[PDB]
Amino acid sequence: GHMNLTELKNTPVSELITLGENMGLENLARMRKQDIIFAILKQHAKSGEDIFGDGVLEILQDGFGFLRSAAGPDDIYVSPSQIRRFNLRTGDTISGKIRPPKEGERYFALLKVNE
Ligand SMILES: [Cu+2]
């Protein structure tokens, strides 16, 4: 539980490269900051550990939502069933356990609200 995507984005890149290289992640030094972060989370998620995220909900016309930073690629996807089961509304500030995209998916996704 100490890795939170919002906190990682606010961490200086030199500390991110150190963490990543310590995890055995090879040459993060050519990557953009956002990509180093993703790389770390994906690798860390393979151990079964919880990882967290947070943002401001916006519900789109199809019924799913994103948690926005209060830039797209790190917006967190929120399914229709989660919005309706937990009564989440546009503009709520949400925190929860997230998961990396699996194959076919493009965005990190909310796993559990309210953690
Ligand atoms: Cu942790």
Summarize the structure.
This protein is of the alpha+beta class and 115 residues long. It has helices at 5-9, 13-22, 33-45, 80-85; strands at residues 51-59, 65-68, 76-78, 93-99, 109-113.
Molecular structure report:
By secondary structure, the chain is an alpha+beta fold. It has two domains: 1-49, Orthogonal Bundle (Transcription Termination Factor Rho, Rna-binding Domain, Chain A, Domain 1); 50-115, Nucleic acid-binding proteins (OB fold (Dihydrolipoamide Acetyltransferase, E2P), Beta Barrel), CATH 2.40.50. The protein is 30% helix and 24% strand. It contains four helices and five strands. The chain has helices spanning 5-9, 13-22, 33-45, 80-85; strands at residues 51-59, 65-68, 76-78, 93-99, 109-113. It has a five-stranded antiparallel beta sheet with strand order 3-2-1-4-5. A hairpin with a 7-residue loop joins β2 and β3. The longest helix is centred in the middle third of the chain and has 13 residues, at 33-45. It is elongated. The relative contact order is 0.18. Bound molecules: copper (II) ion. This is Transcription termination factor Rho.
What is the CATH architecture annotation of the largest domain? Beta Barrel
Please indicate the percent range of residues in DSSP E strands (runs of 2 or more).
15-25%
Amount of helix: 25-40%
How many beta-strand segments?
5
> What is the name of the CATH class of the largest domain?
Mainly Beta
Q: What is Rg?
A: 14 Å
The set of bound ligands, ions and cofactors reads:
copper (II) ion
Q: H/E series, N to C?
A: HHHEEEHEE
GO cellular component, one term: cytosol
Function: Facilitates transcription termination by a mechanism that involves Rho binding to the nascent RNA, activation of Rho's RNA-dependent ATPase activity, and release of the mRNA from the DNA template.
Subunit structure: Homohexamer. The homohexamer assembles into an open ring structure.
Family: Belongs to the Rho family.
